[PDB]
Backbone:
């Protein structure tokens, strides 16, 4: 129903493989690969504010689903894309050659990003406040 | 007694002036000044693990009070210093020309970093799980 919350990374798969494929330096990959931080989502209807802890970087993006928005990626590149809400619990977008699916089930968010044959998956749990 | 917990930044003073003084790139100052992230402390006796969200960077440091430690600073430089316990609720250290005081008051942490005539203050609040 609502994505709002603070989410603690629990586990992830193919962080190093994904970050290498998009061109992150090995130095940043090694620094960030073991960080299990907290991301925050604030949802207000179709409007979302994301404060994402991804490795050693914090990225803060904002968008209304269905509207074109400029979003900062891991590389620092700002891409223009549209994020759609599928049902009430799935955010889906494409940018460059990446497909991204953010799915909320109960208190668990599963983020799946697909680049070629690499499936980068993050599983995070809502902090119960 | 224990610093352990996750803390969300509530307010801060003189971020830009302090970051300019230590030489952070202007582009990182502008993107980081408005981020209100979550920092995590894990304390085991005199041993501390810090996962700090500062602006758009995540910094992970470990140390034992009273022992010389190698710590990463906001610029990425590693410094060697000793962190002391003042009382039971203050961590105090000096490195280069900076004095840092981390004070725990119930659910509030206040971090004060003095560089010459600039006092960079951060106030954070424990996330109640
Ligand atoms: C699409 C713009 C953001 C690009 C950053 C990609 C790195 C992973 C993003 C996953 C965040 C999705 C929200 C769930 C919480 C989390 O996994 O931190
Ligand atoms: C000693 C240098 C550590 C890294 C420098 C980053 C600058 C901000 C450090 C403040 C962290 C103090 C921990 C309390 C929680 C917080 O304020 O995030």
Residues:
């Amino acid at each position: 129903s609502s994505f709002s919350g603070k989410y603690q990374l629990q586990s992830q798969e193919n962080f190093e493989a994904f970050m290498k494929a998009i061109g992150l330096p090995e130095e940043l990959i090694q620094k960030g690969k073991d960080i299990k931080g907290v991301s925050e989502i604030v949802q207000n209807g179709k409007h979302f504010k994301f404060t994402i802890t991804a490795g050693s970087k914090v990225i803060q993006n904002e968008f209304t689903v269905g509207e074109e928005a400029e979003m900062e990626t891991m590389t620092g590149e700002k891409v223009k894309t549209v994020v759609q809400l599928e049902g009430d619990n799935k955010l889906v977008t494409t940018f460059k050659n990446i497909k991204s699916v953010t799915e909320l089930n109960g208190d668990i968010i599963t983020n799946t990003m697909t680049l070629g044959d690499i499936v980068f998956k993050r599983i995070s749990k809502r902090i119960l406040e």
Remarks:
- The helical segments of chain B are 15-21, 26-32.
- Chain B has two helices and eleven strands.
- The domain at 5-126 of chain B is CATH 2.40.128.20 (Lipocalin).
- The first strand of chain B starts at residue 5 and ends at 13.
